Every structure is written in structure tokens, then in C-alpha cells.
Ligand binder design. Structure first.
Ligand SMILES: COC(=O)c1ccc(CN2CCN(C)CC2)cc1
Length: 115
């Protein structure tokens, strides 16, 4: 509350660390469905069904341009990518499996790096 603060967590390295995690995600061999925006003109249903499309290149642009106010808003966009993937793809599909794999990969890096 007013004039009463928890000890200040060091956040000076968060931008650089999030960038490293994103780089490792971009270079994963199962990243290919998530590297670029899903083409809304070529994939039937996607625009209507998926209210907030998200992908690694959009996350990279937002990160490089100071559009994430903190750690958590970054993690929310990353998770949004895999939540969208689950909504639109069967678990037993290549893209479905890519999504589950990448989410697991992300959450480990997240925990090891910040928790
Ligand atoms: C993250 O990307 C997606 O969620 C996504 C991407 C592409 C398609 C188009 N499908 C064309 C037919 N193909 C057998 C499966 C992909 C659908 C969903």
C-alpha cells in the first residue's frame, strides 16, 4: 500500500531474457506452424473463430518495440499462440502435436529462467 513496498525484484534483464526464450522457440523444429500469422484469407473459419490471432513474428515485433509492459504480458501472448492452436486443431494432427510440444518447451524455459 502507500509507502509500503515488497522488496524490489530485479527486472532489468527481463527484456533480454524474454528475447532469448523467443529465439529458442523460433529455432525449434516444431515452430513452423507458429512462425508467421495464420493466413486469414486462405484458412476457412480462422478469422471468425479465433478472436485474437497471435504468432512468434508478431510477438517478436511487439517485444522489439516496447509493447510488453512486463514479463507476464509477454508470457500471455506466447500462451495465446498455443491456446489458439488447441482451439482450431485436433490434438491428433501434426499442428496439434506441434502446439503441445512447443507449449511444454516454453513453460520449462519460463520456469527455469524466472521461477
Ligand atoms: C497455427 O496454425 C494453425 O492453427 C493452422 C495453420 C494452417 C492450417 C491450414 N491447414 C491446411 C491443411 N493441413 C492438412 C492442415 C493445415 C490450419 C491451422
Amino acid at each position: 500500500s502507500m509507502s509500503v513496498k515488497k522488496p524490489k525484484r530485479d527486472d532489468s534483464k527481463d527484456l533480454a531474457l524474454c528475447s532469448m526464450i523467443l529465439t529458442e522457440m523460433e529455432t525449434h523444429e516444431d515452430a513452423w506452424p507458429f512462425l508467421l500469422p495464420v493466413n486469414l484469407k486462405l484458412v476457412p473459419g480462422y478469422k471468425k473463430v479465433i478472436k485474437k490471432p497471435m504468432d512468434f513474428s508478431t510477438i517478436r515485433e511487439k517485444l522489439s518495440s516496447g509493447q510488453y509492459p512486463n514479463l507476464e504480458t509477454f508470457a500471455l501472448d506466447v500462451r495465446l499462440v498455443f491456446d489458439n492452436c488447441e482451439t482450431f486443431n485436433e490434438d491428433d494432427s501434426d499442428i496439434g502435436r506441434a502446439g503441445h510440444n512447443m507449449r511444454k518447451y516454453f513453460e520449462k524455459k519460463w520456469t527455469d529462467t524466472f521461477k
